[PDB]
Amino acid sequence: VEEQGNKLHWAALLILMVIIPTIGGNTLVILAVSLEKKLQYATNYFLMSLAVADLLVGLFVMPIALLTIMFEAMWPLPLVLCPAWLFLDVLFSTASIWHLCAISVDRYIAIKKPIQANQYNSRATAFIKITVVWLISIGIAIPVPIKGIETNPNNITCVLTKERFGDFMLFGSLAAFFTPLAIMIVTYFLTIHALQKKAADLEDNWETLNDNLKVIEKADNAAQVKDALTKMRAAFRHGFDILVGQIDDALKLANEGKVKEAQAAAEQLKTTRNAYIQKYLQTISNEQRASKVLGIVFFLFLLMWCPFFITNITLVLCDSCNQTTLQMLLEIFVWIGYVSSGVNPLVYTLFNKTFRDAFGRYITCNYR
């Protein structure tokens, strides 16, 4: 008879490359938001909340998960801690995916509606959005402790069983991964359409005011400006006004009869328009550059969680598949997601200069 051997080396490899990078990676993100006041704004409370969720995985979920790998199938801890550990696993892992969904949506509405709210009014919006995400995560994770594990059986095997959590494995998976994925996919195309439209209207304005100064440049009479300059009447909230009244000021010279004086005044908007739309051009450029980074990073997160959730629902639907050689894959695919959830806030914040500069001095134990 050939029995299974030791697997301590795998657990050791997990500590080095999963647990330690998870706890440490999320600790840096939390510290950066907590210490550096330059990062203490509403948007980064999604990242801090997310970092906390993933931190608790590496602290209370991942270490105990080693015992399943390192020790026998029997639950070594007290029986009461079995559904709790199962609950915390589902809770925090779901919180990670739904946080990104929240961020994916929140980043989209920031593009469609640039002036969403003030600094104060958006600060409370964060807490509400964070709370909802956590409340969603609880409702998805709470079928586990309510149902419980199978209890003359003295000991217990702390594991989600297909014969019991069949509905939960299938539905929970849909509600925890495939549902936010569906949203992040929709908001993706919504974001792509938003950016290409936001720049389409800018190119429209940049071409319609240039066409109305060319007719202002080559002007024979003030009557030629009496209809052409009026077309520019409707084209930092002070931004739109500094050129509106400026264009209206030129019309005052047109009605007065000063044509040549108005043409030279129209050339004064050359340093006004260029310094304004180019400032709004990099606004879109940075908005497009930040969304592309968010897209790829969030994609890799979901992609690494894919092998688990696709296999998890397969364990339920496919009744023809080998149960033994399918749940053994789950025992590996979970850690792939654990790697994903662990380094998710870190990697995303490595593209931010302030976050990255903060991490550099926190490793050197500076803390300002």
Ligand X SMILES: CC(C)CCC[C@@H](C)[C@H]1CC[C@H]2[C@@H]3CC=C4C[C@@H](O)CC[C@]4(C)[C@H]3CC[C@]12C
Ligand Y SMILES: CCCCCCCC/C=C\CCCCCCCC(=O)OC[C@H](O)CO
Residues that bind ligand Y (CB under 6 A): 104, 107-108, 184-185, 187-188, 191, 291, 294-295, 298-299
93 binds, options ligand X, ligand H8G, ligand Y, none, Cβ within 5 to 8 A by partner type? ligand H8G
CB 296 within 8 Å of CB 207: no
358 binds, options ligand H8G, ligand Y, ligand X, none, Cβ within 5 to 8 A by partner type? none
24 binds, options ligand Y, ligand H8G, ligand X, none, Cβ within 5 to 8 A by partner type? ligand X
Handedness of CA 250, 256, 261, 263 (dihedral sign): positive
CB of 73 to ligand H8G, least distance (A): 11
CB of 11 to ligand H8G, least distance (A): 14
CB 59 within 8 Å of CB 88: no
Q: Is 176 in the site for ligand H8G (CB under 6 A)?
A: yes
CB 358 within 8 Å of CB 35: yes
Q: Is 344 in the site for ligand H8G (CB under 6 A)?
A: no
* Residue selected from 86, 103, 209, 250 as contacting ligand H8G according to rule CB under 6 A: 86
Q: Which is nearer to ligand X, 108 or 335 (by Cβ)?
A: 335
11 binds, options ligand X, ligand H8G, ligand Y, none, Cβ within 5 to 8 A by partner type? none
CB 195 within 8 Å of CB 292: no
CB of 337 to ligand H8G, least distance (A): 6
Q: Which stretch binds ligand H8G (CB under 6 A): 13-21, 171-179, 209-217, 257-265?
A: 171-179
**Helices and strands, counts by H and E, the chain:** 16, 0
How many residues belong to the site for ligand H8G (CB under 6 A)?
16
Q: Which residues of 107-121 are buried (b: 16+ CB within 10 A; e: fewer)?
A: bbebbeeeeeeeeee
CB of 17 to ligand X, least distance (A): 11
- Contacts with ligand X by CB under 6 A lie at 15, 19-20, 23-24, 27, 63, 362-363, 365
How many other CB atoms sit within 10 Å of the CB of residue 26?
28
CB of 325 to ligand Y, least distance (A): 25
Structure tokens at 162: 């297909």
249, amino acid identity: D
CB of 23 to ligand H8G, least distance (A): 17
DSSP one-letter code for 367:
-
User: Which own/partner contact pairs does 159-164 have at CB distance under 8 Å and 24+ positions apart?
Assistant: 159/68, 159/73, 160/86, 162/315, 162/316, 162/323
What's the rounded Cα separation, in Å, for the pair 281 and 202? 8
What is the C-alpha radius of gyration for the chain, rounded to an integer number of angstroms?
A: 29
* Residue selected from 23, 44, 45, 89 as contacting ligand H8G according to rule CB under 6 A: 89
Q: Which is nearer to ligand H8G, 35 or 66 (by Cβ)?
A: 66
- Phi, psi for 206 (deg, rounded to 5): -65, -20
DSSP one-letter code for 218:
S
Q: Is 52 in the site for ligand H8G (CB under 6 A)?
A: no
Q: Which is nearer to ligand X, 19 or 302 (by Cβ)?
A: 19
CB 183 within 8 Å of CB 101: yes
Q: Which residues bind ligand H8G (CB under 6 A)?
A: 65, 86, 89-90, 93-94, 140, 159-160, 168-169, 172-173, 176, 334, 337
